[PDB]
Amino acid sequence: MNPKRIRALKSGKQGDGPVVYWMSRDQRAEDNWALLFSRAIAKEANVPVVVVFCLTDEFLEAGIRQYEFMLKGLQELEVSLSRKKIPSFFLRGDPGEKISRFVKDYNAGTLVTDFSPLRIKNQWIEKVISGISIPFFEVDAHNVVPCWEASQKHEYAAHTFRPKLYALLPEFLEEFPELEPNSVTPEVETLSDVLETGVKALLPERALLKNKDPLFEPWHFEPGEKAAKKVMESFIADRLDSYGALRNDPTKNMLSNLSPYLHFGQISSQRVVLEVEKAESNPGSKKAFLDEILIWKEISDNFCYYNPGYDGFESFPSWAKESLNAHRNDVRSHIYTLEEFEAGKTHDPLWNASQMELLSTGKMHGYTRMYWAKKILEWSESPEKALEIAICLNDRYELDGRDPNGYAGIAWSIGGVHDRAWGEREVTGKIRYMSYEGCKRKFDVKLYIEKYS
Numbered sequence: 001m002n003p004k005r006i007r008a009l010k011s012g013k014q015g016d017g018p019v020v021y022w023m024s025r026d027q028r029a030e031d032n033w034a035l036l037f038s039r040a041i042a043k044e045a046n047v048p049v050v051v052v053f054c055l056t057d058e059f060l061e062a063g064i065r066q067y068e069f070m071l072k073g074l075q076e077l078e079v080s081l082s083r084k085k086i087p088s089f090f091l092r093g094d095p096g097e098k099i100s101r102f103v104k105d106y107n108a109g110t111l112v113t114d115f116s117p118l119r120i121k122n123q124w125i126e127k128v129i130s131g132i133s134i135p136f137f138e139v140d141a142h143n144v145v146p147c148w149e150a151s152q153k154h155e156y157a158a159h160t161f162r163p164k165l166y167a168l169l170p171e172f173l174e175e176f177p178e179l180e181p182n183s184v185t186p187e188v189e190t191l192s193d194v195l196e197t198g199v200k201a202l203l204p205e206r207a208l209l210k211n212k213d214p215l216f217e218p219w220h221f222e223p224g225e226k227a228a229k230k231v232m233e234s235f236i237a238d239r240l241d242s243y244g245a246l247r248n249d250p251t252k253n254m255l256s257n258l259s260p261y262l263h264f265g266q267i268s269s270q271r272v273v274l275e276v277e278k279a280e281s282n283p284g285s286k287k288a289f290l291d292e293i294l295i296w297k298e299i300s301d302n303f304c305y306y307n308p309g310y311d312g313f314e315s316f317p318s319w320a321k322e323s324l325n326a327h328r329n330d331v332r333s334h335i336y337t338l339e340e341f342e343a344g345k346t347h348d349p350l351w352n353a354s355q356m357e358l359l360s361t362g363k364m365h366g367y368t369r370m371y372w373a374k375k376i377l378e379w380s381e382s383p384e385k386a387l388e389i390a391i392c393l394n395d396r397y398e399l400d401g402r403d404p405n406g407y408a409g410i411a412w413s414i415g416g417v418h419d420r421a422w423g424e425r426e427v428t429g430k431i432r433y434m435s436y437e438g439c440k441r442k443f444d445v446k447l448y449i450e451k452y453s
């Protein structure tokens with residue numbers, strides 16, 4: 001176990017009770033460094049380990065598609081942890097109040113959590129730190145190389161972060177040790193009831209069409225740690241060989257479809273990389289997929305970790321801020337509202353078809369995500385407005401939304417973060433432009449539009 005994966009958030013006197021793993025980002029029992037580090041500290045203290053998840057008050061800011069995908073995976077996890085003699089406690093409310101109350105009520109000895117560079121997680125950490133007196137650690141269980149170890153600052157381009165991440169791969173890319181069960185079972189409601197009451201509170205804001213029928217189709221991605229592994233094996237056996245050549249074709253289902261499992265932490269990215277590295281396929285197809293799940297995925301954590309305003313105009317590069325400011329007063333060709341974008345009521349059928357795939361499946365194709373966001377910048381009153389619209393629609397309807405990949409992906413499309421300057425156009429400036437005619441020369445746009453009416 002590498003000690004560089006764990007960082008101390010607060011020092012204190014260790015209690016004599018169970019080590020608490022405050023689970024948040026990585027909701028899985030296998031290949032979890034945070035859960036393994038919690039079990040090792042528990043073994044060294046002759047004390048059991050416990051898992052605590054908090055059902056926050058912010059679930060009403062999303063939809064039913066993410067609330068059901070997350071809770072149905074937690075129901076499977078509670079069984080998996082119970083087979084290892086590990087009990088799971090699911091608290092409802094503010095984690096600044098619940099975690100501090102759970103630590104005091106259960107005489108917690110050490111508190112551990114997984115790493116997340118998002119603002120809402122840092123908000124919880126500040127509230128928990130002020131109300132506990134036991135040691136508090138955090139473990140990077142989402143990235144192969146710890147986010148604070150891959151780079152000590154913000155990397156402005158992928159070609160500057162790639163040699164840093166690959167030079168540390170021989171050290172951190174390793175096999176996971178087996179989770180040891182608790183020696184004996186130690187000494188706040190059923191998830192089925194919390195799922196029922198939460199869905200009932202989310203029903204009025206459910207996405208519906210004119211016939212009062214729901215838009216979301218929940219049969220595209222089955223939640224759970226078991227279904228996540230089956231998707232990973234299917235991608236290696238059937239889709240990995242054709243990933244390098246068809247990853248930019250939305251009419252082909254040649255992607256790994258691992259993002260909803262990677263976001264909620266139902267599968268480990270290090271586990272996927274380990275199986276890809278030992279799989280024999282096209283070298284160009286493996287290089288492209290590892291560049292997305294390692295470089296572009298972990299550089300999104302680096303962007304959110306070293307830029308406090310990662311969701312604001314101030315985090316854009318200086319060349320993009322100067323270019324967008326010089327084109328602020330340029331007359332936009334069209335200006336649509338938030339609901340016009342949300343309902344897919346634009347003049348662009350390719351954009352509307354992209355929005356319909358987001359509304360119906362909760363996972364829009366990777367290539368169309370770049371077109372979908374860049375057109376929001378072209379048809380908004382200001383770059384700040386396009387950021388809010390893109391973040392809203394991405395975090396509301398994407399199953400993998402509310403993730404550092406989304407903010408770093410939106411920042412690349414609108415603010416050119418981790419990009420370079422292109423030909424200067426009006427309105428958009430030097431930001432990389434993506435035209436409708438350019439997409440027709442890349443893939444069958446008529447097939448993608450006809451599929452999502």
Ligand SMILES: Cc1cc2nc3c(=O)[nH]c(=O)nc-3n(C[C@H](O)[C@H](O)[C@H](O)COP(=O)(O)OP(=O)(O)OC[C@H]3O[C@@H](n4cnc5c(N)ncnc54)[C@H](O)[C@@H]3O)c2cc1C
Pocket residue numbers: 247255256257258259260262263292293294296297300364365366367369370373394395398400401402403405406407409410413
């Ligand atoms: C405007 C926009 C919004 C996005 N919204 C999200 C989002 O809400 N949530 C999210 O997790 N990703 C987002 N992305 C990144 C990317 O679109 C998705 O990760 C990708 O489509 C996920 O589907 P997949 O697993 O089938 O792709 P795959 O090609 O099979 O890639 C596998 C994994 O590599 C990672 N990856 C791939 N592409 C990227 C990328 N461009 N940036 C970072 N990581 C990547 C992902 O973790 C992905 O799961 C967004 C990108 C853009 C441009």
